[PDB]
Amino acid sequence: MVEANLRLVISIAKKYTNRGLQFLDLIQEGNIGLMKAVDKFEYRRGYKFSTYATWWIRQAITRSIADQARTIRIPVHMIETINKLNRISRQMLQEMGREPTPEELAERMLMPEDKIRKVLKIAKEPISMETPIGDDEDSHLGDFIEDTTLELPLDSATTESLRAATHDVLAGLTAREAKVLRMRFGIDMNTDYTLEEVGKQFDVTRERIRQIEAKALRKLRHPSRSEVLRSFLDD
Amino acid sequence: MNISDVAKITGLTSKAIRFYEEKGLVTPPMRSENGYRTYTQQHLNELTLLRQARQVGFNLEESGELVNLFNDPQRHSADVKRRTLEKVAEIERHIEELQSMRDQLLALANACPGDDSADCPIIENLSGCC
Amino acid sequence: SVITVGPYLRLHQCGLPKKMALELFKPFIYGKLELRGLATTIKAAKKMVE
DNA sequence: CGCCGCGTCAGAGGAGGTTAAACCTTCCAGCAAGGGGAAGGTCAAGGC
DNA sequence: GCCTTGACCTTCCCCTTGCTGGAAGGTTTAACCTGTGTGCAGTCTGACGCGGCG
Numbered sequence A: 001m002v003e004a005n006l007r008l009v010i011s012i013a014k015k016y017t018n019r020g021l022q023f024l025d026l027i028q029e030g031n032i033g034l035m036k037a038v039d040k041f042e043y044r045r046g047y048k049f050s051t052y053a054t055w056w057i058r059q060a061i062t063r064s065i066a067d068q069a070r071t072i073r074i075p076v077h078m079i080e081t082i083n084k085l086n087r088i089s090r091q092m093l094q095e096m097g098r099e100p101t102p103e104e105l106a107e108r109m110l111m112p113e114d115k116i117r118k119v120l121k122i123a124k125e126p127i128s129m130e131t132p133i134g135d136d137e138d139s140h141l142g143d144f145i146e147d148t149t150l151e152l153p154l155d156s157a158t159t160e161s162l163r164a165a166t167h168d169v170l171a172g173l174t175a176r177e178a179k180v181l182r183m184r185f186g187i188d189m190n191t192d193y194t195l196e197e198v199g200k201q202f203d204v205t206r207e208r209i210r211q212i213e214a215k216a217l218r219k220l221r222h223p224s225r226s227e228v229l230r231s232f233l234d235d
Numbered sequence B: 001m002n003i004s005d006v007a008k009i010t011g012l013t014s015k016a017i018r019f020y021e022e023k024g025l026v027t028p029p030m031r032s033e034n035g036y037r038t039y040t041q042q043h044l045n046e047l048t049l050l051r052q053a054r055q056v057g058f059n060l061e062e063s064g065e066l067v068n069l070f071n072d073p074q075r076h077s078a079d080v081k082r083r084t085l086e087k088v089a090e091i092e093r094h095i096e097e098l099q100s101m102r103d104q105l106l107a108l109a110n111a112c113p114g115d116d117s118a119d120c121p122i123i124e125n126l127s128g129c130c
Numbered sequence C: 001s002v003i004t005v006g007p008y009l010r011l012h013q014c015g016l017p018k019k020m021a022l023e024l025f026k027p028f029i030y031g032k033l034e035l036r037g038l039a040t041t042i043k044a045a046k047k048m049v050e
Numbered sequence D: 001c002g003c004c005g006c007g008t009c010a011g012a013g014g015a016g017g018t019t020a021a022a023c024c025t026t027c028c029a030g031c032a033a034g035g036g037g038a039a040g041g042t043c044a045a046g047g048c
Numbered sequence E: 001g002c003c004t005t006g007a008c009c010t011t012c013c014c015c016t017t018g019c020t021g022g023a024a025g026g027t028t029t030a031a032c033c034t035g036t037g038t039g040c041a042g043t044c045t046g047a048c049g050c051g052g053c054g
């Protein structure tokens, strides 16, 4: 029964071979198609096997073409929405002599403009890194982009000098206070600690601790020490 | 059964039905191997009660008590009528306080000139100013 | 850049536009500006260059 | 055996076209109208 | 400068009704239908290898 009906499969497939994916994988999917068609065939309906099997095949391939054929998995319902939409817009540009407006075919499609607009934002495929933006083979597209993620050297020096300035300022103030602030803010360590953690590591105090770091600011506001850090107000 | 058929009979939807089910207010219908909520006649009429009870005004919990009585063959009609007339009393007091509302509303309204003026007495008397 | 002729020169020398070498020799300048104390740090130095 | 034949390798931005629906399932977001409680700070005010 | 001491703000998270909407994901229809290809690509080309074929 499998070998009987393979030419049916290639016929269906090459109707569906509109250039989405490729031939053979589609064909193989038609073959699993035919297998499960025969796997549960009632024969006393009198009908010919062909048609029953045929629509099961159609479902198999039109599913798999949806699941695959993109770098980006778009699940099925978005796909069929797109298909519906384009079938509509063809008619709209028959009749208007023009491409249609989103509002128009949307209200005909009975749904608001936002979803249409997002569908349109989403629909188009990627663009092949090695495409020749150069008219000849003088340039590929992969040359003219940048790593806008990594670092910058001047910024590294900026941070380093800032840190030097900061702990230079710290050493001018009392040891306990500066250290308590290092753990309060995680300077020169891996971690960060807070009111009660740092306190009860030292001792119970809560509100006067707040006032202690306040007077630390007071001794630090101090228009003699800011000027090594006044530059970093721009920071 | 199938589920949409039952919900279009009774007017509900599978979503509301499943809310009620998660509230434990009816018999749990079994599933199938596929997973369809296997409804029955018991589920049908229990659902009809759980529907019409909140229509009457017996809440989620109280309509659920009506249901577990619907399962109970010992059920006290006495109790049932106490529940009834208790809810009658709450609806009465609801009506009465809403009447107090509408009374004060119309007291405020009829005093207002309604002469497109900024000196609306209602506005300034709703605030504790002046 | 484009070339042209320096006839008054001594052949161990070359012509040069300013701004080219200015941006080329930039961080050198930043460093010794910090050294002299005009620009305390790097951002200020860069602004003075600009 | 010595051709004759064949094969591999050298040298300014920009895209395009169509091919299902009907029934099901789980699970998260969201409303009016707030209410409770963690957990850290923060306003005055003390006692050495 | 050490202890609080009480009282106050702010933010985050969680919790109560009665559902509703939406995404993401699954399984079946009986008239029927049986062998691409489908537009390439215009053959660069000289040495050197190597396989069959004498």
Ligand SMILES: [Cu+2]
Pocket (backbone or CB within 6 Å): B112, B113, B114, B119, B120, B121, B122, B123
């Ligand atoms: Cu008025």
